[PDB]
Amino acid sequence: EDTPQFKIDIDQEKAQALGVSINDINTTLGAAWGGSYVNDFIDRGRVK
């Protein structure tokens, strides 16, 4: 069934007025709240 969800609207005019890129806004929100797969490291001979 449909469930409550948190709609957030980015004001494009306010972002442009303060000199804040939408990429930086969407990355900050996504990375922090959603998580972001950056790249791989090698843990005891295994790529992770």
Binding site residues, another protein, CB under 8 A? 4, 11-14, 16-17
Beta bridge partners of 21: none
- Candidates 5-13, 23-31, 32-40: pick the segment binding Na ion (CB under 5 A): 23-31
Distance of alpha carbon 48 from alpha carbon 40, whole angstroms:
5
Give the sign of the dihedral formed by CA 28, CA 32, CA 36, CA 41: positive
Residue 47 binding result from another protein, Na ion, none, given CB thresholds of 5 to 8 Å by partner type: none
Which of another protein, Na ion, none is residue 26 near (CB under 5 to 8 Å by kind)? Na ion
> 16, 26, 29, 31: which one contacts Na ion (CB under 5 A)?
26
- Please name the residue that has the structure tokens 């950056």: 38
